[PDB]
Design a protein around this ligand. Sequence first.
Ligand code: ADP
Ligand code: BEF
Ligand code: MG
Ligand code: ZN
Ligand code: ZN
Lengths: 645, 645
Amino acid sequence: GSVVIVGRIILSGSGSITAYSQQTRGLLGCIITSLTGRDKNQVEGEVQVVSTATQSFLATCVNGVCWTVYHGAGSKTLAGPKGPITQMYTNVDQDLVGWQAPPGARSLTPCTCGSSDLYLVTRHADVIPVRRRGDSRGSLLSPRPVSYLKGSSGGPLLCPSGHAVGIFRAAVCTRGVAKAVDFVPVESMETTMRSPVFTDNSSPPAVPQSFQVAHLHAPTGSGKSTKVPAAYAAQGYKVLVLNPSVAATLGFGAYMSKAHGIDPNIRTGVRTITTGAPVTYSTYGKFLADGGCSGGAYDIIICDECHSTDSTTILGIGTVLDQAETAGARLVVLATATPPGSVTVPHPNIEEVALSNTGEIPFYGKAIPIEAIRGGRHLIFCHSKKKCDELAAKLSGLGINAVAYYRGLDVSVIPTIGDVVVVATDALMTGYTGDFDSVIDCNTCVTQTVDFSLDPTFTIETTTVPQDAVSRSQRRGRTGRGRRGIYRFVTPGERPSGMFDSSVLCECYDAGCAWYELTPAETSVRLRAYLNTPGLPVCQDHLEFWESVFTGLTHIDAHFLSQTKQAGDNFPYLVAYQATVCARAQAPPPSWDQMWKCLIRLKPTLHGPTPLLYRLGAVQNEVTLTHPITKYIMACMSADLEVVT
Amino acid sequence: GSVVIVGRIILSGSGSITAYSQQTRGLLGCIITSLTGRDKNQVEGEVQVVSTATQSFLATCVNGVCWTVYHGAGSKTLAGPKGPITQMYTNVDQDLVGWQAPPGARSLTPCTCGSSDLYLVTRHADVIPVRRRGDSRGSLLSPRPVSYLKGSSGGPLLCPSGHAVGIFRAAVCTRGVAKAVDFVPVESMETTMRSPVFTDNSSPPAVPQSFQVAHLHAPTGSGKSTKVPAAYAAQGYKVLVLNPSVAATLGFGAYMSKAHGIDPNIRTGVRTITTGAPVTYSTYGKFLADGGCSGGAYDIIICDECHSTDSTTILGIGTVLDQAETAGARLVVLATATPPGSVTVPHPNIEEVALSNTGEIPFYGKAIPIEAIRGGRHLIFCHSKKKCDELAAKLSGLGINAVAYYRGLDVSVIPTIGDVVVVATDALMTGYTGDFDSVIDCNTCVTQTVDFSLDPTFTIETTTVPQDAVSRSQRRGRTGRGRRGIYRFVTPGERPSGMFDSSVLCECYDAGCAWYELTPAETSVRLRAYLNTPGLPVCQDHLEFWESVFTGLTHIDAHFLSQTKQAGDNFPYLVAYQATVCARAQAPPPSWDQMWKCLIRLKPTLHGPTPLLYRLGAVQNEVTLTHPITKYIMACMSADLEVVT
RNA sequence: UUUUUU
Ligand SMILES: Nc1ncnc2c1ncn2[C@@H]1O[C@H](COP(=O)(O)OP(=O)(O)O)[C@@H](O)[C@H]1O
Ligand code: BEF
Ligand SMILES: [Mg+2]
Ligand SMILES: [Zn+2]
Ligand SMILES: [Zn+2]
C-alpha cells in the first residue's frame, strides 16, 4: 500500500494567496500504483494531493523534502519513477514524515518574517485565514465543522508572503466544531533533518551521576530483562523490573537463579515471593497495586516492554516516570525491541509463506492444509474467543490434538510437550512463554475507539481492524526462536505502530478508580509524565477531558464495582457506575447483555427509560437524558478536543 | 466499472445450516477486473461475495439467476469470462437485479415448506435465526446493531431444509438496533422472471377506455414535452402538462405557437397567461398552489420530467396520482428520458469529449480551453451557485459573454439569441431548451441526506457527491436538442438513477405545512399514492415517521415562517420552527449562520443555550435537550425505521 | 449549500 500523488494544489506566486486543484489520477493509476509503487507521472508544484487505497490527504515540499503526517502516511513508501521511494525522515513524536522531493518538485521557503496572520490551504484549494496563537496552534476566524478540514492533514500554513510556517495535523474542536488548528512548525522539520540518521542505544546505559530517563532498543532475547539487570545488580545496584505479563515475571526467578545465580523478588497478584535480593520482578499491575514507588528502594527501574499500548503498562510507566526521581532512583530505563514507527523486516530463522485457498481448513477467507499442522507444535492466532473455540473444535473433530487459549482460561490447557495446535487470541502473550514450530496468523486485531458522538456524550466501540507492526512482529515472533520456524499469513498488509486511541486513556482512568484507589487527578499526573516523554507511543492529549469525566462519577455502589471487577470485563468502573445510576433511579440498564449482569437480581424491580451516561455497547431500552450525571458528562463534552484530520 | 466476484460463502450440504467464506480476489484483482469487466476465475457456489469500487455485498443464485439488490449493484454489468455481463433483470421497484448465472455457479432451491423458522446468511458467514412475520419481513431473535448487517445485502434467507426464501435488502431499526429484516421474497424473483426482458414505452400511450397510469420513455430532445401534448390535443383531448422547471414552462409558451400552432395556457407564480387553449402547461408548484386536480378539467395529465426528485415534483406527482381518476382524467402519463434503472447511453446528436488537465480555465480538477466556448452558445454546469458566480466572473474577465443562472435570478438574464456562455446550477438541468452548442459538466452535485443521529434526534446534511445517471443524461441532454452538440465532462462514471433520500420526504411535509396548507396527514395520502406507483423513483418508506414529527410542530410563529418562505432556502418550516422555539425561550439559534437570519435583529436579547430540536447545520452554541418539543421528537425516533444496510 | 410554490 504505497502513497501516491494523485493531484496538486496550485498556489499563487504573487499578491493575495489563491489556490486551485488539478487532479492527475482518477483511481486509475491510483489504487494500481498504490501497489506497483511506480509513478510515471511527473511531479510539479509544491503542494501534493496524495492518497492511499483508503485515505487521501496532503503533503508539502520544504527544503527539497516532501513532508506529511505520520498518522496519515505511516512508514509507507512514496510512489515515483524508480518504483517505490523509501521515507528519509520518520518522526512519530512530532507526527511528521518526509520523502526526498521527486523530479520537478519545487519547495516553499521557511517563513522568516515572523508573521501572526497565517493561511491554511485545504485539499479543496480553500485558503483559510488562521490567527497564530502558539508555536503549533492557530485560531480559526470562521469556525468550521471538523468534516470540512478532513483530508487536509499535511497541508501548509503559509504566511502573507507565502512562506511555509508549518503543516496542518489536527483540529481543536468544540462539540465537533473546529475552532483552532494544531500544526507542525517548519522548525520541527529543520530539527528533523539535523538529527543523527542513526541513534544507537543497543547498550545498557551507564548509571548517570544524576537521575536520568534512558532508552534501550535491542532485539528480543538479548538479556534486556535478564542479563542487563544481572550486570547492574552485579555492580551492587538495586533493580526493580516491570513487565506486562505475569507469566513472564514469574518465569524470571527460576531463570535468574539459573544462568545468573540470584534469587530475585517476584511480585504478582497471584504470587508474591520476598527473598530479600537486590533485583525484583513485578508486573505493571502488581507495581500499581503496591502504590508505585517507595523510599529509595531502587536506583534502577527498567520498564520492560515499554512499547505495549495496554492501559495497564501505560499507566505503570507513567507512575514510574513521575515518581522514580523522588523515590531516590538514579536511572529509569525504557526497554523495548520495537519502538514506535518500527517496521516489519525479514527474520533469518523464519520462512514466511502466504496462505492460499487450497487447504482442508477454512481460515479467514483462505485455508490451512492439514499436513501443515498435523504433527508438530503450532500456534494459530484468531481475533476472537469464539473463533478460537470454533477452530479448536473443528481441529479436534479431525483427530488433531488442539486446544483454545484466551483470557479466562488457565495456561494448564496448553501442553508444554508433545504435538498440539494452540488456537489463541493475543492473550497468549501475557500468560504463556513457549514457542512453536510454526505460527498461522489471521492478521486482524480487535480494538476499541472512542467516538465523541454527542448522543448524549461519547461511545466506546469495538471493531476488528488489520494488525499493526507490533502485532505482526510479536505474533510471528512466537516461532523461529533458537531454531527454524514458519510463519503463514492471510494478508501481507501491515499498519503503522507507535500510536494508541483516546479510549485507552479512558481505560487508564477507569483502572485508577477501580483497582488502585487513584484519583483521576493522580492518574493525570502519571499519564502527563508518560505523554511528556519522547520515544514512547503517542496518543492525542485528552487528559483534561477524561479527568473531568471520571471526577464527577461520585459515590459508586461498591457491590456493583466488586461484581464488574471480578467478572473481569473492560471498563468495570464505567459499567459499575452506569449500573449504580440505574439502580438508584429504579431504572433498567441499557440492555440485558452480559455486560450488565450485575443488575440481574433487580431485573423485576427496574422499569422505564435508562438514564444513559454514555454508550459502551448496544442500547436496546428507551433512554432519558434528564439525570444530572448525564448533564454533567454533557458539560464535559464542551472542552477543547484535539482530533486528527 | 463492473461488479466483481471477489469471494463466496459456502453452505453446509447436510445437517444444521453452517457457512464459511472463501476469498478469491484481493483489491488489485478487484479493480483491474472491474474495468476490463473480464473475470476468468471459476465461479462456484450459490452465494457470491461481490464488490464495486466503493461497497461490498452479496449475491445469491436462484433458478439459474445470480441476484442482488439494486441499491448495491445499480444497473452495473458483472465481470465475466468473455467480458462484462449485462443485467438480465433490473426491477428497481423490488430493489432486485439479476444476471444470468455464470457457468459453474449453482442455484438454491426455493422454499416450499412455508416454514417460518428462517436463517439469514451474512457476509461474514454468520447464520442468524429469523422468525418469518410477513411475506417479506422477519424478526431477529437477537437484535443487533445495524452496522453488523452492513454489507450483507443480497444474502439469502433460508428455511431449515436449506431452501431459499428470499434475499436480504434492509434492516428495520429502533434507535439504531435492528430488530427485524426486510427481504425480497423468492416469489418476486419468479414474478420478475415471468415478465419480459425487453420493454418499450417509447410511443405515446393510447388513451384507454377506463382510467390508466402509463409511462413514456424517450431520449432527450425527442418531443415528449411538445409534440406529444400537441398530438393528443390535435385529437380532441384536453391536456395538462406538469413540469418541474419554470424556465421550461415559460419556454413552451412562445415555442408552441410557431412550432405546433398551439398557444397554450400557462401557469406559474410569475405568469398565469390564460388562452383557453386545450393544452395547459404548469409547474408542479403552481399546480399544488391551485390545490391540485379540479373536477372534469382534463382528459390527460402529463407528469413531465417524472425522473425529477425534488420535493415539489414528488408531492405534485403524488397529488395527480391520488386525485386524477376522481377528477375525470382518462390517462396519467409519467414521462421522462431517464426512468429509474436507466443508464447513460450514447445520444445520436451528441459527441462526448473528456476535459483534460490542459486549458486556460481550471474546472473541477481539470481544465477548460477558452477556444471551446469562445464562439457559439454554451452551457456550463457548476455544483454551487457560488461556483457559478466565480466562474462566470472569471469568464467575463476573459472577453467572454457569460451569465450565471440559478433560482432567485429571473429567467430573463439568459440571452435567447447569439453567442453566450451560461453558467448554471441544476435550475437548468431538466426540461429546458436554450439552443446550446455544447454542455460542459462538473459531474458533481449537491444533495441532502438524513442521518438518524439521536444527538438528539436527526441530522440533515448537505454534501456534494458524484452525479447520478439521470443527472449526466439530463445535463448532457441540454445540448444536441434538434441538432449536433458537444458534451464535455470531468469524470466518466455515474451513480445509479431512480433512488432518493428520506430527507426528501421530510421536505415534502415541510412544503406541505409551509406552502400548500396541507396537514401532515393529507401530505401522507399524496406521498402514499406516489410510493404505491410502479416505475417511479424509490425511497425508503418513512411516511409514518415523518408525519409523526410534523404533527407535533404546532403554533409556529407565522412571522418567522413568512420570512423563511420568502428567503427561499431549504426547510423553511423546520427552520422557522426552531426559530420559534428559540424566540419563545429567549435563546439564540444553533448558530449565527445565514440560515438563522430571521433571528438576527433579536440577537441582543437572546442568551443561554439553544433548545435544539434537530440538526440542520453546524451547531456552534451550547444546547439544552429539555424542551418539550425535543422530547416529542426523541419519542418519534423510537418508531420502526427501515434502513438499507 | 441544487430545484419551487411568493
Ligand atoms: N424553446 C425552444 N426553442 C427552440 N427549440 C425548441 C424549444 N423547445 C423545443 N425545441 C425543439 O423541439 C424539440 C423537442 O423538444 P422537447 O419536447 O423539449 O423534447 P423532450 O421533451 O423529449 O426532451 C427539441 O429537439 C428542440 O429542438
Ligand atoms: F427529455 Be427532454 F430533455 F425533456
Ligand atoms: Mg421534456
Ligand atoms: Zn513569512
Ligand atoms: Zn422450506
